[PDB]
């Protein structure tokens, strides 16, 4: 049951809540619903609640943002939730299981990709779950990044945990730090996923497969090879530093060996993005500065945020008050 008004007719399943995709007979235009209705379950409605703060106040060609949301005109009739936005062709994923994509396409989408960060990242807001599916681009090409569910505020101060500390995060585009003493609160964590997903633009899978939690350290210092003492240093912690000591010794696949095809400027700034310290790794904006990306370079064209960005009653409450400018009045 996809109830969404007058205004969007013509529905058809689209994917997994509910996603259709509804005819806009407002816009002259088909569009994208999602149907999310998670409030019996409250670890699955702050979810909403940030993702809907956050894509309201964002307003970036390369960020998706929401047209209008429908729902009852009352707390109290209001049961499912209906967040409309752009209706794309489809995303990195689909595209990088079926298409190969030229060296001119894989620029631009790292392009895209860190423009859009840029503008996420100054509102001191980090995506944390940055990976093909949540990359949605469009019949010309035109990239945009969507879903904000697992995001929060920068907090480097309070950045870290103990060795083997818990992560929601996509495995595959984990920062090695996650499973070390890294919470995820430091923008380097979606540097990093930018650039497992730039070695995945570059071969057609995954980088760093992890099957499991250390699976995915293991996977990483495949490649790169066992950490320098230096890096080692930076970690305090015991446990963690202790586990990568009692590691065998690794030594560092050269990147024009897994990707011998690939551009040795765009490797150049690859090797950058995936550096084990996460202190040493690249900025976004010293990545859009990067000679790969030189002809779309353009800092006044890259516009960045204007300012920085509960009990089974307030979040019902809070949602239903962030979804209040789409009714009448
Ligand atoms: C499958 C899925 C899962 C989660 C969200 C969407 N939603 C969206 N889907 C598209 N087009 C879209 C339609 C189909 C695919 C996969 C395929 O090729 O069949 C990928 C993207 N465009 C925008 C959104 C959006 N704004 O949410 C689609």
């Given at each position: 049951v996809f109830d969404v008004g007058p205004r969007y007719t013509n529905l058809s399943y689209i994917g997994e809540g509910m996603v259709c995709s509804a005819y806009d007979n407002l816009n002259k235009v088909r569009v994208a619903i999602k149907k999310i209705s998670p409030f019996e379950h409250q670890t699955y409605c702050q979810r909403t609640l940030r993702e809907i703060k956050i894509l309201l106040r964002f307003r970036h060609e390369n960020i998706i943002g929401i047209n209008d949301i429908i729902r009852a005109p009352t707390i109290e009739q209001m049961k499912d939730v209906y967040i409309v936005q752009d209706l794309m062709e489809t995303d990195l994923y689909k595209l990088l299981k079926t298409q190969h994509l030229s060296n001119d396409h894989i620029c631009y989408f790292l392009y895209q990709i860190l423009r859009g960060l840029k503008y996420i990242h100054s509102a001191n807001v980090l995506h944390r779950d940055l990976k093909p599916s949540n990359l949605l681009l469009n019949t010309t090409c035109d990239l945009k990044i969507c879903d904000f569910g697992l995001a929060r505020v920068a907090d480097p101060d309070h950045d870290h945990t103990g060795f083997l500390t818990e992560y929601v995060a996509t495995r595959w585009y984990r920062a090695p730090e996650i499973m070390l003493?890294?919470?995820?609160?430091?923008?380097?964590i979606d540097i990093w996923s930018v650039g497992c997903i730039l070695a995945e633009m570059l071969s057609?899978?995954?980088?760093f497969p992890g099957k499991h939690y250390l699976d995915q350290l293991n996977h990483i210092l495949g490649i790169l090879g066992s950490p320098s003492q230096e890096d080692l240093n930076c970690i305090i912690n015991l446990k963690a530093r202790n586990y990568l000591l009692s590691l065998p010794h690794k030594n560092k696949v050269p990147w024009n060996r897994l990707?011998?095809?690939?551009?040795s400027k765009a490797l150049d700034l690859l090797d950058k993005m995936l550096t084990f310290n996460p202190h040493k790794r690249i900025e976004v904006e010293q990545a859009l500065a990067h000679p790969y990306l030189e002809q779309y370079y353009d800092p006044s064209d890259e516009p960045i945020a204007e300012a920085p960005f509960l009990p089974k009653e307030k979040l019902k409450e809070l949602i239903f008050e962030e979804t209040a400018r789409f009714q009448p009045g």
């Open positions: 003493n890294s919470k995820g609160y430091t923008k380097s057609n899978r995954p980088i990707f011998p095809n690939a551009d």
